[PDB]
Design a protein around this ligand. Structure first.
Ligand SMILES: CN(c1ccccc1C(=O)Nc1ccc(S(=O)(=O)N2CCN(c3cc(C(F)(F)F)cc(Cl)n3)CC2)cc1)S(C)(=O)=O
Ligand SMILES: [Mn+2]
Ligand SMILES: [Mn+2]
Length: 239
């Protein structure tokens, strides 16, 4: 089986989510054929030179899954678009483009973070166009670390709408697929539509707010799965 997760929004202020992700990496992830992280792994990112210890802890935990034989892939989200090749090397992850077409046990499946499907939010799209401009990224990354931290703290306070239906059909027909997996919208669901004159499905991941969420693809089915962060130890009413 192949696993997909997204929108964990890891941050030091939310240690329970970090604990849940480490348990996931130590258990379920080790049995997968591959692990895809479709964006928003971190709540924020200001560059791979950030000494934030959470970054090194996450990188080591993912690297252990990679060393165990499970290839791990990453597509950027709107929160962590500055994740670069230095962190990819530390974690063992492979960085993918904003859109990729996968063969999963015969299925042609398109994957993306999903924010590019939100073509009605012109305000966010203008932000995305700016922060994805290469010279703007290079200029920001050249700033001192403490300056970048101050900018990000203010910009987070300065800065979710849903996808546009026609944008979904356009992407699914551009890639000629009947399956699409994405996150960003934080609305876990399975939507049936029509693309390429045939039934098609858009599978949406959930954010790691109170419980975990993943999509598991097998040769036989597609599974949207919700699970608790930590080991809920059972313990023991009247008639
Ligand atoms: C969907 N959302 C939005 C909806 C509408 C609009 C935006 C978003 C949105 O995604 N905003 C957002 C994303 C990441 C962070 S950040 O803290 O991680 N960080 C990243 C690096 N970053 C700069 C800064 C610059 C420069 F200073 F030059 F401007 C350049 C460059 Cl290249 N990167 C500083 C900030 C902070 C805010 S929403 C509800 O916010 O989630
Ligand atoms: Mn998200
Ligand atoms: Mn997002």
């Amino acid at each position: 089986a192949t696993l997909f997760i997204a929108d964990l929004h890891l941050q030091t202020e939310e240690p329970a989510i970090t604990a849940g992700f480490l348990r996931f990496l130590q258990g379920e992830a080790r049995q997968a054929d591959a692990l895809y992280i479709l964006g928003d792994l971190f709540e924020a990112w200001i560059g791979d030179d950030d000494p934030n210890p959470l970054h090194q802890q996450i990188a080591s935990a993912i690297k252990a899954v990679v060393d165990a034989g499970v290839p791990c892939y990453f597509i950027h989200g709107n929160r962590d678009f500055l994740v670069g090749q230095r962190f990819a090397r530390q974690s063992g992850m492979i960085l993918l483009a904003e859109e990729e077409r996968l063969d999963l046990y015969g299925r042609e499946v398109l994957i993306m973070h999903g924010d590019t499907l939100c073509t009605d939010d012109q305000g966010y799209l203008a932000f995305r166009a700016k922060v994805h401009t290469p010279w703007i990224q290079r200029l920001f990354l050249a700033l001192p670390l403490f300056i970048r931290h101050r900018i990000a703290a203010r910009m987070r306070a300065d800065s979710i709408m849903d996808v546009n239906p026609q944008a979904v059909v356009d992407a699914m027909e551009r890639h000629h697929v009947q399956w699409l997996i994405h996150g960003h919208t934080h609305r876990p669901a399975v939507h049936e539509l029509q693309a390429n004159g045939q039934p098609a499905w858009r599978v949406v991941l959930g954010a790691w707010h109170s419980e975990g969420s993943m999509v598991k693809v097998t040769p036989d089915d597609v599974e949207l799965i919700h699970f608790p962060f930590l080991e809920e130890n059972l313990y023991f009413h009247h008639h």
